[PDB]
Amino acid sequence: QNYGINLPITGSMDTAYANSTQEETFLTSTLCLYYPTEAATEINDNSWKDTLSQLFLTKGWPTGSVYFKEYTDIASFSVDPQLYCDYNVVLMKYDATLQLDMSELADLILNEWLCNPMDITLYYYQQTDEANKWISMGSSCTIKVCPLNTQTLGIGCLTTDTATFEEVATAEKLVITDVVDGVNHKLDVTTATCTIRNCKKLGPRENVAVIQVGGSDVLDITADPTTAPQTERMMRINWKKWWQVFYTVVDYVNQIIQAMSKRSRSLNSAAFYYRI
Amino acid sequence: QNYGINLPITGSMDTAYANSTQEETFLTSTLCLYYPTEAATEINDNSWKDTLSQLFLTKGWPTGSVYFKEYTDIASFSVDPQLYCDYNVVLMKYDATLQLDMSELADLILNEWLCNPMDITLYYYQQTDEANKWISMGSSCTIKVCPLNTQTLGIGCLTTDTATFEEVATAEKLVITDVVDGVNHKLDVTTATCTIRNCKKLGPRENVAVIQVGGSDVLDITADPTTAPQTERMMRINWKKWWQVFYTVVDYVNQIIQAMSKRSRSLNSAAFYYRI
Amino acid sequence: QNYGINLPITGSMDTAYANSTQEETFLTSTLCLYYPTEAATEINDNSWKDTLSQLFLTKGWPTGSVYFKEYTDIASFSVDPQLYCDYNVVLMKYDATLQLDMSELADLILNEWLCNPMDITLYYYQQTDEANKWISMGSSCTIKVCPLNTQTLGIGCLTTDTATFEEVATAEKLVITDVVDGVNHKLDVTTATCTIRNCKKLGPRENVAVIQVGGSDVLDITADPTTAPQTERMMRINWKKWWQVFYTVVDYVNQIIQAMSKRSRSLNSAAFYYRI
Amino acid sequence: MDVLYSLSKTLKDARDKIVEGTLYSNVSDLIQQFNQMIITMNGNEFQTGGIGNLPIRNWNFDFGLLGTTLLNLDANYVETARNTIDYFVDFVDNVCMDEMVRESQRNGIAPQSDSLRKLSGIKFKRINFDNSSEYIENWNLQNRRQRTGFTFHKPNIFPYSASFTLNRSQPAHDNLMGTMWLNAGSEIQVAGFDYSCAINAPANIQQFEHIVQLRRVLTTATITLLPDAERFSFPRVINSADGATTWYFNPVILRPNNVEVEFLLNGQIINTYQARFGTIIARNFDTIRLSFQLMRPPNMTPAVAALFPNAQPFEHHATVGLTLRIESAVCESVLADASKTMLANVTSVRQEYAIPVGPVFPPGMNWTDLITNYSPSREDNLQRVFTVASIRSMLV
Ligand SMILES: *[C@@H]1O[C@H](CO)[C@@H](O)[C@H](O)[C@H]1NC(C)=O
Ligand SMILES: *[C@@H]1O[C@H](CO)[C@@H](O)[C@H](O)[C@H]1NC(C)=O
Ligand SMILES: *[C@@H]1O[C@H](CO)[C@@H](O)[C@H](O)[C@H]1NC(C)=O
Ligand SMILES: [Ca+2]
Ligand SMILES: [Ca+2]
Ligand SMILES: [Ca+2]
Ligand SMILES: [Ca+2]
Ligand SMILES: [Ca+2]
Ligand SMILES: [Ca+2]
Ligand SMILES: [Ca+2]
Ligand SMILES: [Ca+2]
Ligand SMILES: [Ca+2]
Ligand SMILES: [Ca+2]
Ligand SMILES: [Ca+2]
Ligand SMILES: [Ca+2]
Ligand SMILES: [Cl-]
Ligand SMILES: [Zn+2]
């Protein structure tokens, strides 16, 4: 495939449509439903996974295809999220106090990322392009940035005295930092508690859809202030009970998968591609 | 004259636009305004209805054609609201805690529903297609559902023990239940307290507009997660004083009515289709 | 540019060989060396990493491109090893008592495995084809399997009694289970201690080479009894001093890298095939 | 062919000029030619064939000569002439139809029907006179290895093809770069689309190229070139190359940049037009090379900047189009065109009599297949049948 990636593909605009491949897609794929712990707590049933699997089977998914992964909350799930199967549907409970954290998690799991290690103890770092960010995650991230000049002298911050650096995060389980491009920055990070990587946004992630439970349209998966795209994979629903949410997810699974594309799944479940 | 038969219409271009019919409609149609009680409490005037009627008369509506209907809150208004005017405008106050109830009310009044009776004690029920929902209304609806399998046996529930059922509504005054299609469900509902009906969404209801007073775009009048359509009949206004709200409503009644159309289901062309 | 589509390549003879790309690859790529702790213990020097970096720099690798990752022993290294460099060379000490564990580690890192989750509590599992195996990893994996018949009844085992199951692993930190294909197995695994996954062997992993230090040819990276392929990525060296081992590795890094290829999956072309 | 054309021409002249009351001096030479034709054809038995549903017809010629002693033609003379002319015209029409429905893999240029083979004998060569029609003129030139010329208004030179090529694509078909084109009869509507609007392209420019290889060389061609392809300027839902899925096209049209139309002959650039639109002349060419560019506008008003973000999703897709229309041309070979009726006549005759598919032409005389594989044998057969059809159209 690779040697012919840089080759044209020609198609006639009168080629008959193939039959629906949705049945074959379900019979050969695997679905993961990521829900918060409060969902299973409020459902208060131990066999609900079996019921949901049977309902999915009624909807065409063979038994064994659908998987259910639990996460405590948005913050914990953001610590190196793992996307396991072909189709990942993430139910994210909305909280008006965690808009930026929801935005960061959606940005991380709805886009492809190519990350490299950042030895902040040794080297200064730059964000070369608008697609370049610094993604840091772990138990607690606290990132302090000191912009430098051509002579390495910090601007509004002494290089030695970290206390005069500029705070961009505090005790974050995940943060995507965006500094001015072309300026070398000295970084102070709680490396013992969390890891920071220099990442590049390759493009969208088709196998991951995020359903925001309750709330309003608040996700901003792009750092650009002028753009706040609402892609087809960013759903939003209103809720009073979680059984209704899960029935809505099952009943409209065809529509949800339609909003997602195949071949986007990676061998590894990691949220980014790491190069060291 | 030919009722019950769909005859194609074969108009042409260059027929020339007719004059504005807005004045004639205002002369021959009635307008109902639905507002919460707190609106009248804040206005605190015993002649405000008469003044609004006069102001509407400045806009073309004959005196006695505009009606002012009052409701306590959203929950009370969601108790089988009857909208009988030619044009209905519902001033609905926003509440972050009642997002789903707001959405359900809007879905119930902004759309046409063909509803048939449900006897949960006698029959099991399934939702045939994506337009089929279960709408329950009354003093307090508590719906518990037991999905069944092809062996008419409960899935994660016992058909004889309603405690094992799955709760989708609690103390609701209006709830729209969407379950997985093609599955028979046993239903336990507080029939003495409220009534449930099997309802098919025929399409939009054009004579009803909803003006959300304050808040953000939170309404979702479609059960599809992938779709959250904001039709032209859903207005949103930021507010501090109800007098300003009513002055805005009267001053843009032209625009409000333009966003609406005469109820198709309640005119002679709908004779022997469902009503009138 | 055309990702996800396999375009044929139609090269010709007499196109003339290009110059050696070895120097460019060494300049632009990174090399990870994985060695056991006892290697560093026997070397007993605090600058040996720097000396090896310099010696590699004599062979063309820029300084800071060769990394030295350490692992305690094979069992600890078999706990989801993450090999992230462009080229990975694993110095694996031979132990006559750990032949199968060595084989399993090599099979896991010398091959590509597309893994999807397994929920033994919820579903029964079968291995569809000869490329499907069950890979379990963690602190301690104890897997017991109950084959089922077409009547979903255990064969030589009771689905309700796990003591009658058949043990295929015990206290393993990595194990690859091959069961009879086309048979549903109930599984009892120490899910709290280790995780299991349904993994399909896609093919070779080319950026990982394994140098067996001492011993004989005992590796078997294929479950087929009839095949025991010794690929060019499986070196064997007789040793007495670890310094000699590392000098041999650095002096023949040309040969070692020639035996390897850039990971076909981890490059831009594989975009929308599995990664990147 | 020349004898059949001469028969048709003599009959047409007789129908047009032998009219009541006309001076005999208006028709003296015509009457001599007509009488020579009668003398040559008298006593000869002809058969038009039973191929397909075309009926077998037998033709016998025993006619008296037209008179000469009148000064002005009267009713009797005109009726006698009309009777003879009607029989001869029916014969010529049937011979033309018989020849039109026939094809030979080898001697496609040589006559195929028995009647036309008999007319190619020496005894009929005396019937031959003025060969002035364009088709018979080119036929005679082609019998002598001379440069032929057929003038076509809107020649049907491009086989139908509504195709697209993607240079950048993904399974999701949301960041695409490629070209769409329709090559209709005399039309080339091409459009290069970039979904990213050349945000990441070097120099903020995306190059698009379209090559149309004509199956025959066109000369003295007039071409209208316009800077927009209206056919690919509205939203479309388009099948993928394999047909396994559909993708969404939502073009926003930008002015094509660095427009260069090259007209090439045998790989050599004969004509070149840069940034030219309207009427242009391509004097001799067999290949068209349209190169254009989508240039990202460096200065954008807020709405334009809103259309084109710096990254995905791309909801508005930049498109630059060209339209090429050959109004007139000259070709050494026969072609269908918007003005003549030769292809229509041959196809109509073949369809009316249920002529089974032969070894030369495609089934149903489909023009797209015929021009896609316009081989020398097909060229010979097609010129033969088109010349016969032109001869027949003189009378029918
Ligand atoms: C597609 O559907 C058609 C119509 O039902 C059926 O005849 C055909 O076999 C199906 N499969 C393929 C590969 O076309
Ligand atoms: C329509 O409006 C025009 C101009 O507003 C007016 O002159 C005319 O009388 C009205 N009625 C008709 C039937 O045209
Ligand atoms: C390739 O190698 C040859 C001989 O080693 C050298 O002369 C030449 O410059 C190199 N580069 C290219 C592009 O041929
Ligand atoms: Ca955060
Ligand atoms: Ca500072
Ligand atoms: Ca930046
Ligand atoms: Ca933004
Ligand atoms: Ca409610
Ligand atoms: Ca239950
Ligand atoms: Ca339903
Ligand atoms: Ca919705
Ligand atoms: Ca083992
Ligand atoms: Ca047993
Ligand atoms: Ca097996
Ligand atoms: Ca083997
Ligand atoms: Cl024309
Ligand atoms: Zn495609």
Side-chain angles (χ1 to χ4, degrees):
Chain A
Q1 313 78 19
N2 42 84
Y3 287 102
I5 281 295
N6 291 287
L7 289 179
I9 178 62
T10 307
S12 175
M13 310 191 65
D14 295 337
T15 307
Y17 296 146
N19 289 343
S20 298
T21 63
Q22 188 209 264
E23 206 174 277
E24 205 271 328
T25 295
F26 289 5
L27 291 167
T28 192
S29 291
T30 42
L31 177 58
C32 300
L33 199 31
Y34 305 82
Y35 60 93
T37 285
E38 45 260 42
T41 293
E42 192 244 33
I43 275 160
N44 190 52
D45 197 339
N46 287 306
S47 69
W48 69 293
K49 308 257 209 94
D50 212 76
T51 73
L52 285 178
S53 55
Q54 286 182 274
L55 292 176
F56 275 116
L57 183 95
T58 284
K59 225 71 173 168
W61 293 80
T63 303
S65 37
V66 192
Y67 287 88
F68 309 86
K69 308 267 164 143
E70 194 181 70
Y71 70 92
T72 306
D73 81 285
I74 267 51
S76 67
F77 180 50
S78 305
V79 180
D80 189 1
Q82 295 284 317
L83 308 149
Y84 294 107
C85 61
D86 294 303
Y87 290 115
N88 307 291
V89 185
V90 175
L91 309 177
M92 147 194 298
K93 168 149 177 299
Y94 160 87
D95 178 59
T97 311
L98 309 161
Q99 276 192 14
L100 179 69
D101 300 87
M102 296 164 70
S103 277
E104 283 168 344
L105 180 73
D107 203 343
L108 185 43
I109 72 187
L110 296 174
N111 310 297
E112 299 300 329
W113 291 94
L114 174 64
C115 297
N116 281 65
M118 272 165 78
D119 214 298
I120 60 108
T121 312
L122 286 176
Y123 317 96
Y124 314 125
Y125 282 102
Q126 277 171 209
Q127 278 176 358
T128 67
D129 190 54
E130 58 96 47
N132 197 345
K133 305 283 172 282
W134 297 331
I135 311 196
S136 69
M137 51 188 103
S139 319
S140 86
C141 284
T142 295
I143 302 93
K144 307 277 217 72
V145 304
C146 186
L148 323 170
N149 54 359
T150 299
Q151 289 279 319
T152 304
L153 307 167
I155 316 175
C157 47
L158 287 191
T159 325
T160 57
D161 188 3
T162 289
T164 77
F165 284 19
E166 276 62 55
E167 194 162 3
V168 291
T170 313
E172 294 285 349
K173 293 245 189 70
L174 171 82
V175 57
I176 298 157
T177 326
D178 168 43
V179 298
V180 188
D181 309 315
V183 197
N184 272 307
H185 284 88
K186 183 164 207 285
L187 292 211
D188 191 80
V189 192
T190 62
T191 321
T193 71
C194 100
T195 295
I196 182 163
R197 295 121 162 169
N198 173 286
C199 301
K200 310 274 278 143
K201 205 196 273 189
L202 307 176
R205 198 136 176 207
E206 275 61 57
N207 49 338
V208 181
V210 167
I211 312 191
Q212 198 214 71
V213 170
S216 197
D217 291 342
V218 314
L219 307 182
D220 189 330
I221 59 136
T222 189
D224 180 65
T226 58
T227 308
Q230 301 321 304
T231 74
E232 209 49 42
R233 273 166 298 118
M234 313 169 26
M235 284 147 260
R236 205 192 61 75
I237 50 137
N238 283 161
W239 69 300
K240 275 287 286 191
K241 301 206 112 68
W242 280 105
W243 266 122
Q244 185 51 63
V245 169
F246 274 94
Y247 289 156
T248 309
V249 164
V250 173
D251 214 14
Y252 297 95
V253 68
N254 288 343
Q255 298 286 81
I256 294 165
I257 298 308
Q258 270 249 282
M260 293 151 81
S261 324
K262 285 295 299 223
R263 311 190 230 286
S264 198
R265 159 159 83 135
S266 39
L267 216 65
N268 72 336
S269 40
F272 47 95
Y273 309 107
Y274 188 46
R275 300 296 170 83
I276 162 168
Chain B
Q1 289 307 330
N2 269 312
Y3 295 124
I5 307 300
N6 188 16
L7 282 310
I9 297 276
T10 311
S12 94
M13 289 71 154
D14 220 43
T15 72
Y17 300 144
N19 281 341
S20 297
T21 64
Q22 187 208 87
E23 194 229 333
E24 159 269 329
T25 54
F26 285 15
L27 255 294
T28 64
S29 42
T30 52
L31 171 59
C32 276
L33 251 176
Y34 302 88
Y35 59 97
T37 289
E38 53 248 57
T41 307
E42 191 217 274
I43 284 168
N44 202 106
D45 188 344
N46 293 347
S47 52
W48 73 294
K49 264 160 196 225
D50 217 44
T51 70
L52 288 175
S53 287
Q54 267 184 257
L55 290 174
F56 274 112
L57 164 63
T58 53
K59 286 283 147 146
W61 300 81
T63 287
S65 60
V66 184
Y67 304 79
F68 295 87
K69 260 76 164 54
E70 159 162 280
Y71 63 85
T72 307
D73 65 318
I74 283 169
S76 91
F77 188 49
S78 312
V79 184
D80 187 56
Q82 308 305 64
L83 317 158
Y84 290 129
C85 273
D86 281 285
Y87 293 109
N88 308 287
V89 182
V90 179
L91 292 182
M92 165 166 98
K93 193 200 213 269
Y94 162 81
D95 199 63
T97 300
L98 296 146
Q99 263 187 29
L100 176 52
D101 301 86
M102 264 187 297
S103 302
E104 279 168 342
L105 173 57
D107 202 340
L108 185 102
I109 51 139
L110 290 180
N111 293 326
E112 289 277 325
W113 295 88
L114 177 76
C115 296
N116 40 307
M118 268 171 89
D119 189 301
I120 64 194
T121 282
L122 216 169
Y123 317 107
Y124 300 157
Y125 285 92
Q126 66 178 51
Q127 281 173 0
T128 59
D129 82 271
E130 60 100 48
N132 195 181
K133 304 282 174 280
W134 297 329
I135 288 156
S136 80
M137 277 143 34
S139 312
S140 71
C141 289
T142 295
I143 297 97
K144 289 114 86 177
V145 313
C146 177
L148 311 166
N149 62 334
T150 73
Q151 283 60 249
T152 185
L153 279 188
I155 297 157
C157 48
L158 300 196
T159 36
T160 53
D161 184 2
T162 81
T164 75
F165 286 19
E166 279 65 55
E167 209 160 36
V168 291
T170 290
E172 299 289 351
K173 264 155 167 244
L174 152 65
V175 53
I176 315 182
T177 316
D178 174 44
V179 295
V180 188
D181 300 310
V183 175
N184 294 270
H185 297 254
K186 176 142 205 217
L187 297 179
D188 182 5
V189 188
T190 67
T191 72
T193 322
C194 96
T195 176
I196 193 161
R197 260 132 60 166
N198 203 19
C199 296
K200 256 86 146 65
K201 207 202 290 226
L202 310 154
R205 169 141 177 190
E206 315 94 49
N207 51 356
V208 179
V210 166
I211 311 204
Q212 207 222 57
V213 177
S216 35
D217 293 288
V218 311
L219 271 41
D220 192 32
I221 61 154
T222 185
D224 200 58
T226 41
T227 312
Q230 305 313 121
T231 75
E232 44 261 7
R233 258 139 49 229
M234 320 176 176
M235 300 90 149
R236 217 185 33 77
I237 75 190
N238 288 339
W239 73 297
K240 263 176 130 144
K241 313 288 267 152
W242 278 104
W243 260 128
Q244 250 291 291
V245 174
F246 278 83
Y247 284 168
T248 301
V249 161
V250 66
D251 210 25
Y252 295 79
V253 65
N254 274 214
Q255 298 300 332
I256 284 143
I257 299 307
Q258 267 225 304
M260 290 135 79
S261 206
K262 302 314 303 286
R263 211 188 180 187
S264 53
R265 304 291 184 171
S266 293
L267 46 75
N268 305 95
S269 297
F272 304 95
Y273 275 125
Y274 279 111
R275 63 204 76 272
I276 275 191
Chain C
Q1 291 307 330
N2 269 312
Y3 294 122
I5 307 300
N6 188 16
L7 283 311
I9 292 277
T10 311
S12 95
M13 289 71 154
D14 220 43
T15 72
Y17 300 144
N19 281 342
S20 297
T21 64
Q22 187 208 87
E23 194 229 333
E24 158 269 329
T25 54
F26 285 15
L27 255 294
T28 64
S29 42
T30 52
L31 171 59
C32 276
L33 247 183
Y34 301 88
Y35 60 97
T37 289
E38 53 248 57
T41 307
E42 191 218 274
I43 285 168
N44 202 106
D45 188 344
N46 292 347
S47 52
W48 72 294
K49 264 160 196 225
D50 217 44
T51 70
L52 288 175
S53 287
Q54 266 184 257
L55 289 174
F56 274 112
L57 164 63
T58 53
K59 286 284 147 146
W61 300 81
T63 286
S65 60
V66 184
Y67 305 80
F68 295 87
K69 261 76 165 54
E70 159 163 280
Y71 63 84
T72 307
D73 64 317
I74 283 169
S76 91
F77 188 49
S78 313
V79 184
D80 187 56
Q82 309 305 64
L83 317 158
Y84 289 130
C85 272
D86 281 285
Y87 293 109
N88 308 287
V89 181
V90 179
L91 291 182
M92 165 166 98
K93 193 200 213 269
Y94 163 81
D95 199 63
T97 301
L98 296 146
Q99 262 186 29
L100 175 53
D101 301 86
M102 264 187 297
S103 302
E104 278 169 341
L105 173 57
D107 202 341
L108 185 102
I109 52 139
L110 291 180
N111 293 326
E112 290 276 324
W113 295 88
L114 177 76
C115 296
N116 40 306
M118 268 171 88
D119 189 301
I120 64 194
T121 282
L122 208 177
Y123 316 107
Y124 300 157
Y125 286 92
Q126 66 179 51
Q127 282 173 0
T128 59
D129 82 271
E130 60 100 48
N132 195 181
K133 304 282 174 280
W134 298 330
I135 288 156
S136 80
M137 277 143 34
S139 312
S140 72
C141 290
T142 295
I143 296 97
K144 289 114 86 177
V145 313
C146 178
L148 311 166
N149 62 334
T150 74
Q151 284 60 249
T152 185
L153 279 188
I155 297 157
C157 48
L158 300 196
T159 36
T160 53
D161 184 2
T162 81
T164 75
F165 286 20
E166 279 65 56
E167 209 160 36
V168 291
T170 290
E172 299 289 351
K173 263 155 167 244
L174 152 65
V175 53
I176 315 182
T177 316
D178 174 44
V179 295
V180 189
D181 300 310
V183 175
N184 295 270
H185 297 254
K186 176 143 205 217
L187 297 179
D188 182 5
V189 188
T190 67
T191 71
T193 322
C194 96
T195 176
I196 193 161
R197 259 132 60 166
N198 203 19
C199 296
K200 256 87 147 65
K201 207 202 290 226
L202 311 155
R205 169 142 177 190
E206 314 94 48
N207 51 356
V208 179
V210 166
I211 310 204
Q212 207 222 57
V213 177
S216 35
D217 293 288
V218 310
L219 271 41
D220 192 32
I221 61 154
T222 185
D224 200 57
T226 41
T227 312
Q230 305 314 301
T231 75
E232 44 261 8
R233 258 140 49 229
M234 320 176 176
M235 300 90 149
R236 217 186 34 77
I237 75 190
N238 289 339
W239 73 297
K240 263 177 130 144
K241 313 289 267 152
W242 279 104
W243 260 128
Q244 250 291 291
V245 174
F246 278 83
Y247 284 167
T248 301
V249 161
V250 66
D251 209 25
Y252 294 77
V253 65
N254 274 214
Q255 298 301 332
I256 284 143
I257 299 307
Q258 267 225 304
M260 290 135 78
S261 205
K262 302 314 303 286
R263 211 188 180 187
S264 53
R265 306 290 184 171
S266 293
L267 45 75
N268 306 94
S269 295
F272 305 95
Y273 277 123
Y274 279 110
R275 70 208 85 276
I276 271 290
Chain D
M1 185 75 87
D2 59 346
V3 171
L4 177 63
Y5 170 87
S6 296
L7 292 164
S8 194
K9 190 84 170 313
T10 308
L11 293 163
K12 181 162 138 55
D13 267 326
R15 262 230 300 263
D16 297 343
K17 280 142 161 161
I18 294 159
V19 298
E20 222 277 338
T22 192
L23 280 171
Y24 182 78
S25 34
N26 288 324
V27 289
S28 304
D29 295 319
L30 170 54
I31 292 294
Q32 288 305 115
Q33 167 69 29
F34 200 89
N35 277 340
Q36 172 111 141
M37 168 189 84
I38 288 157
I39 278 141
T40 302
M41 295 291 295
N42 270 351
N44 293 275
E45 230 283 321
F46 283 92
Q47 208 187 57
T48 44
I51 189 168
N53 298 339
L54 194 69
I56 280 149
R57 275 194 79 163
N58 286 286
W59 307 89
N60 258 311
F61 290 88
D62 208 19
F63 290 91
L65 294 203
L66 306 194
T68 295
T69 70
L70 290 176
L71 286 170
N72 282 275
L73 306 190
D74 63 322
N76 301 328
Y77 196 96
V78 166
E79 304 335 319
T80 290
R82 293 250 197 79
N83 202 74
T84 310
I85 290 156
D86 291 348
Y87 189 87
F88 262 87
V89 165
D90 203 36
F91 165 73
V92 161
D93 165 69
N94 270 250
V95 169
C96 285
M97 270 184 321
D98 196 336
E99 189 67 10
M100 277 152 76
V101 297
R102 285 180 202 279
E103 48 185 65
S104 203
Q105 196 69 241
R106 276 278 78 243
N107 313 288
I109 204 82
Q112 305 309 326
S113 70
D114 290 337
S115 270
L116 196 56
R117 286 197 275 257
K118 190 174 152 72
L119 284 185
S120 76
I122 190 54
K123 110 180 81 182
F124 301 103
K125 192 56 155 118
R126 277 200 225 293
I127 278 152
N128 189 219
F129 87 130
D130 178 20
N131 306 334
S132 47
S133 100
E134 190 224 61
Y135 267 76
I136 200 76
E137 213 253 341
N138 280 312
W139 184 266
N140 298 138
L141 290 166
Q142 149 269 316
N143 282 324
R144 296 223 316 293
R145 291 279 303 286
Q146 309 295 296
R147 188 126 161 92
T148 36
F150 295 95
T151 308
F152 301 100
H153 171 49
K154 291 178 74 182
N156 203 145
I157 186 64
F158 311 122
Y160 173 81
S161 82
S163 276
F164 71 89
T165 279
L166 293 167
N167 294 93
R168 202 181 50 230
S169 181
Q170 312 82 37
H173 293 82
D174 59 289
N175 182 47
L176 301 181
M177 189 270 292
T179 37
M180 279 162 202
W181 63 87
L182 174 80
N183 301 346
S186 291
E187 327 275 313
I188 303 295
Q189 245 165 333
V190 67
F193 51 94
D194 193 346
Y195 281 28
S196 79
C197 199
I199 191 94
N200 297 341
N204 274 337
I205 290 153
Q206 183 49 259
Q207 248 283 326
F208 302 106
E209 214 203 35
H210 191 44
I211 292 155
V212 200
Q213 266 150 26
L214 284 66
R215 241 59 70 161
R216 292 291 185 266
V217 176
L218 297 188
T219 45
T220 313
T222 311
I223 288 105
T224 53
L225 174 63
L226 298 163
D228 299 307
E230 303 171 17
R231 185 160 187 103
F232 307 111
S233 303
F234 40 87
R236 316 172 63 93
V237 170
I238 305 166
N239 67 277
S240 54
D242 60 334
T245 176
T246 38
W247 45 290
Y248 180 46
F249 191 44
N250 195 52
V252 52
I253 304 320
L254 275 80
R255 183 212 52 233
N257 207 245
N258 265 96
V259 168
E260 310 174 4
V261 183
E262 293 134 275
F263 293 94
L264 278 72
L265 188 79
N266 201 44
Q268 266 95 70
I269 296 164
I270 307 311
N271 265 115
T272 280
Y273 292 105
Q274 278 114 327
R276 184 82 76 72
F277 300 112
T279 319
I280 46 173
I281 301 305
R283 62 162 140 117
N284 182 31
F285 74 100
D286 59 1
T287 287
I288 309 186
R289 194 184 161 286
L290 312 149
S291 88
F292 44 107
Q293 292 175 339
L294 183 269
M295 157 143 77
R296 164 175 271 272
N299 301 319
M300 290 187 289
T301 42
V304 188
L307 300 159
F308 312 129
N310 281 81
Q312 308 180 41
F314 298 129
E315 308 186 314
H316 306 273
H317 315 126
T319 322
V320 282
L322 294 165
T323 305
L324 212 71
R325 256 181 231 130
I326 302 166
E327 297 266 33
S328 322
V330 173
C331 187
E332 277 224 59
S333 307
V334 292
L335 309 157
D337 80 317
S339 293
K340 294 135 154 217
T341 65
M342 272 56 264
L343 175 69
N345 269 119
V346 174
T347 315
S348 296
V349 174
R350 263 146 189 275
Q351 279 160 0
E352 197 220 290
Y353 299 107
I355 304 299
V357 55
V360 181
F361 293 135
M365 210 78 171
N366 161 232
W367 181 245
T368 298
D369 287 10
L370 185 60
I371 196 68
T372 282
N373 295 293
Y374 200 19
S375 79
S377 158
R378 286 182 159 187
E379 204 213 8
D380 278 292
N381 276 278
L382 191 69
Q383 208 206 342
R384 210 227 322 125
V385 299
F386 274 27
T387 308
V388 174
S390 70
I391 290 157
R392 183 166 165 268
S393 88
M394 294 167 68
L395 296 172
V396 167

